[PDB]
Amino acid sequence: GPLGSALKRINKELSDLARDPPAQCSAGPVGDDMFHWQATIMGPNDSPYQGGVFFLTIHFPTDYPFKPPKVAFTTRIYHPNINSNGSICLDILRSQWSPALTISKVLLSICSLLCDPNPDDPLVPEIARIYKTDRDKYNRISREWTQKYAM
Amino acid sequence: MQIFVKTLTGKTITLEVEPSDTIENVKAKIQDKEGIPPDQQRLIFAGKQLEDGRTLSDYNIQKESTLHLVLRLRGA
Numbered sequence: 086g087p088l089g090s091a092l093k094r095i096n097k098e099l100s101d102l103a104r105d106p107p108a109q110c111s112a113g114p115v116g117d118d119m120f121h122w123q124a125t126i127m128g129p130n131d132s133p134y135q136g137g138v139f140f141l142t143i144h145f146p147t148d149y150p151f152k153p154p155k156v157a158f159t160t161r162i163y164h165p166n167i168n169s170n171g172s173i174c175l176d177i178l179r180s181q182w183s184p185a186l187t188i189s190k191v192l193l194s195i196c197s198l199l200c201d202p203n204p205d206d207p208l209v210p211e212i213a214r215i216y217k218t219d220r221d222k223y224n225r226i227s228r229e230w231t232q233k234y235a236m
Numbered sequence: 237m238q239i240f241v242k243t244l245t246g247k248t249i250t251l252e253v254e255p256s257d258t259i260e261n262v263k264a265k266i267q268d269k270e271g272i273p274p275d276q277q278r279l280i281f282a283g284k285q286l287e288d289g290r291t292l293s294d295y296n297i298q299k300e301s302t303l304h305l306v307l308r309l310r311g312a
Contacts (some may be wrong), residue, residue: 166312174312207276208312211245214271 091149095119098188110192112143120145124156124192128235132200133227134162137235141171141195143188153182156191163230165202165213173198174208239292240302241266241279249305255293259286266305278308 096119102112112124122143128134139160146152156178158171166174177186177194207213216223241249251265263274279286281295281303297303 180311206310206312208309210272210276210307211270218271 088147091145091147092119094150095145101187102189105189107189107192110189110196112141112188112192120147120149122188126192126196126199128231129196129200133224134199134231134235137231139235150184150186153178154188154191156195161230161234163212163227164199165204165207165209165216166198168208172208174203174206237292237299239297239299241305242302243305244307248302253292255297256291258289258291260288262292262303263288275310276308278306280304280306 099113099119109127109129110125112122115121115123122145124141124143126139126141128137128139137160139158139162142157142159144155146155156173158167158173161169161171173195175194175198177191202213202216204213204216212223215226237253237255239251239253241251243249249266249269251262251269253262253265259279260274262279263277266277267273274288281297281301284295286295286303
């Protein structure tokens with residue numbers, strides 16, 4: 086069924102992550118449910134999040150890969166495209182999703198989001214304002230939150 | 237005339253306005269103090285979403301009134 090189709094796609098991507106592991110990223114099933122994953126992202130070197138470890142939840146819908154996976158942060162982070170609930174604003178997770186894309190590509194796209202936010206279409210307007218107009222303050226506060234919650 | 241604008245973070249904004257000022261004008265004033273563009277602004281008062289094109293007197297907003305500033309999301 087639809088559930089059955091998603092299951093084998095999930096397993097395929099899981100084996101591909103084993104053969105070709107992502108750099109500074111890892112992901113896998115929480116328990117024995119293949120539709121519910123847990124992921125980690127190291128703070129990118131070219132970002133004020135460097136040194137921190139950020140955990141994410143990944144839930145695969147039953148219509149995967151025809152519908153995008155649902156990804157959210159569990160670790161708190163100071164970002165204009167990520168709110169206090171861990172919700173993420175990213176095109177690849179919605180309007181620009183494609184079945185040809187993978188979880189590996191999603192995690193890489195999130196990594197880039199941490200290095201270069203999209204302030205013009207933000208999730209947290211106040212943080213976006215600081216990013217655009219006072220980059221030093223943005224970097225300063227980002228590092229502080231990294232120290233407090235990502236260590 | 238002096239009104240107040242409360243944010244989700246708890247910050248209270250103090251604005252100097254006139255009864256004939258449109259909601260768009262008010263959003264411009266908020267941009268002057270907070271730097272947040274009008275299209276990312278969403279104003280709530282008397283249980284209603286204040287629409288751009290109407291004045292403060294249209295909603296009968298008077299002195300010492302407190303507006304609620306919330307998020308206006310555009311695809312994310």
